[PDB]
């Protein structure tokens, strides 16, 4: 079962005791500045990364703005303020401005998917794709087709208070 990796987490994030949930806190924790820790962007990775095969996990999503989640290439930049874009190696859905988005670039792609509660992520490192489905009916939300060239990690980001993400098993 997937858990969030506290050594990668931006020190403003608050992880749940069971390491499944993340929200944004009001104060930066005093944590060691490991090279793998996101020091500015509000991100955390799961402790498990994948180099081959096909993998599923599910993410319970808050109803309000502030979250983005999906996958990141391991080489995603951790230090300084970085763009949240496919070019930086993040492939994600996002709730922002009251709208669900696939975070394409240079312009995001608005999704007309209706309300989301929990999303199944399907990562395929054999063919090269990451897909998102709303669990109530498995309707397709978005697929990024990517020739991944390194290990890929589940990615979570929460940039405002009042929302959350939770790995659901």
């Amino acid at each position: 079962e997937l858990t969030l990796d506290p050594d990668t987490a931006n020190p403003r994030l608050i992880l749940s005791l069971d390491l499944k949930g993340v929200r944004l806190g009001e104060r930066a924790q005093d944590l060691p500045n490991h090279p793998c820790r996101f020091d500015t962007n509000t991100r955390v990775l799961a402790s498990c990364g994948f180099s081959s095969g096909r993998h599923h996990w599910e993410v319970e999503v808050g109803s309000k703005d502030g979250w983005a989640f999906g996958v990141a290439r391991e080489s995603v930049r951790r230090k300084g303020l970085t763009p949240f874009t496919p070019e930086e190696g993040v492939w994600a859905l996002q709730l922002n401005g009251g709208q669900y988005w696939a975070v394409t670039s240079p312009e995001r792609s608005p999704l007309s998917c209706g309300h989301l509660s929990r999303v199944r992520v399907a990562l395929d490192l054999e063919v090269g794709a990451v897909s998102f489905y709303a669990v109530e009916d498995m309707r397709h939300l978005y697929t990024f087709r990517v020739n991944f060239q390194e290990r890929v990690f589940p990615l979570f980001s929460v940039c405002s208070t009042g929302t959350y993400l939770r790995i659901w098993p």
Binding site: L24, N41, T42, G66, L81, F84, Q94, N96, G97, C159
Partner: peptide
């Protein structure tokens, strides 16, 4: 002020 710059 959504904070999305820091996503």
């Amino acid at each position: 002020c959504s904070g999305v710059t820091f996503q």
